[PDB]
Amino acid sequence: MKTEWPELVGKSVEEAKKVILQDKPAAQIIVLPVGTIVTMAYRIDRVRLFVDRLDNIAQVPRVG
Amino acid sequence: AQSVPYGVSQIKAPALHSQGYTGSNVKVAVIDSGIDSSHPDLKVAGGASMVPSETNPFQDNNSHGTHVAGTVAALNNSIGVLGVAPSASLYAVKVLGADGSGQYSWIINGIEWAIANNMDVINMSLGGPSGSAALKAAVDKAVASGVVVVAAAGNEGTSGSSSTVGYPGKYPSVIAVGAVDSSNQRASFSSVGPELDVMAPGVSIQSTLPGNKYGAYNGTSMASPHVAGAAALILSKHPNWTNTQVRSSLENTTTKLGDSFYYGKGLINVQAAAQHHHHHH
Ligand SMILES: [Ca+2]
Ligand code: NA
Structure with a gap:
């Protein structure tokens, strides 16, 4: 079961959402700016996407 | 009737409660998404918000801060859950918005508020990959x-x-x-x-969730407030102990588990920490 997407780093946030939803269709995706601080609960249904100021993926997406 | 979540028992908080120590007069800042102050199983003593578009620290639009707070300090009564340090003075220092994120300056502003307001303990169930x-x-x-x-x-x-x-x-x-x-x-x-x-x-x-609810969450966010609550129990029994001493007492009395790379010093044991002489069990 795929839980990380290192191949999405540097892609657009749009492509990342499409790809993650193909692998995990019930994913709860939240887009956040890279370099913010976030809550540290672990939610297996969630995938945060950290984007740079250009809206490309700046961190390996993972479930949690 | 009240329930004692297994984690409160696991860290041996009830041993402190039976000695008469519950975190009274210890100020704990939950630096997080706010705390729902209307929850009947919480008593929020004060706080402040550093989130520009969410100015009320007593409204938790995310849920996470309220859950963390209940592990620190859910009240000792006949409802809901029991907290680690149920008499602690609980402060909602809101630095994360509804989406669970905050800017570094907001977190720093919350830490500065906590220092200025003489907090004894800060809990940060939060983080990021860069300093x-x-x-x-x-x-x-x-x-x-x-x-x-x-x-x-x-x-x-x-x-x-x-x-x-x-x-x-x-x-x-x-x-x-x-x-x-x-x-x-x-x-x-x-x-x-x-x-x-x-x-x-x-x-x-x-733990407690906004709108008078409860629920089970997972994460290092949930582990941290057991230790912040344990620090408050320790200070309530030893009010002159410094932070250095509280920290050493927790580190020096863990139950060692595996390799420290994976387990650090092991599981905290607040009963052992709050004795004068410390050793691992
Ligand atoms: Ca209670
Ligand atoms: Na550290």
């Missing part, structure tokens, strides 16, 4: 000023031989807390590395 000099300076200043600073280690799991502990947990001045389950097994998501200090329960942890 900043200003973040490091804020936590170091809090510790130099006498505050016990506790944070979640992070939920990055393993990555070979690399540390995956996040900031501010990764700073030496901060106690970074990893997560175990009820069998004392490390949770698969729990961050690892030589910066991991101690472990606490972080799997299926029941």
Whole structure:
């Protein structure tokens, strides 16, 4: 079961959402700016996407 | 009737409660998404919001801060859950918005507020993969000023031989807390590395949620407030102990588990920590 997407780093946030939803269709995706601080609960249904100021993926997406 | 979540028992908080110590008069800042002050199983003493578009720290639009707060300090009564330090003076220091995120300056502003308002303990169930000099300076200043600073280690799991502990947990001045389950097994998501200090329960942890609810959450976020609550119990029994002493007491009395890369010093044991003489069980 795929839980990380290192191949999405540097892609657009749009492509990342499409790809993650193909692998995990019930994913709860939240887009956040890279370099913010976030809550540290672990939610297996969630995938945060950290984007740079250009809206490309700046961190390996993972479930949690 | 009230229920005692397994993690409160697991860290031996009831031993302190039976001695008569529950965190009275200890000020704990939950630096997080706010705390729902209308919850009947919480008593919020004060707070402040650093989130520009969410000015009320007593409204928790995310839920996470309220859950963390209930592990620190859910009230001792006939309802809901019991907190680790149910008499602590609980402060909602809102630095994260509804989406669970905040800017570094907001977190730093919250830490500065906590120092200015004489907090005894800070809990930061939060983190990110990079530090900043200003973040490091804020936590170091809090510790130099006498505050016990506790944070979640992070939920990055393993990555070979690399540390995956996040900031501010990764700073030496901060106690970074990893997560175990009820069998004392490390949770698969729990961050690892030589910066991991101690472990606490972080799997299926029941606590308070906004709108007078309860529920079970997982994460190093859930483990951290067991340690922040334990620090408050210790200070309520030993009100002159410094933060240095509180931190050593927790580190020096853990139940050792596996290799320190994965488990740090092991599971905290607040009964043993709050004795004068410390050793591991
Ligand atoms: Ca209660
Ligand atoms: Na640390």
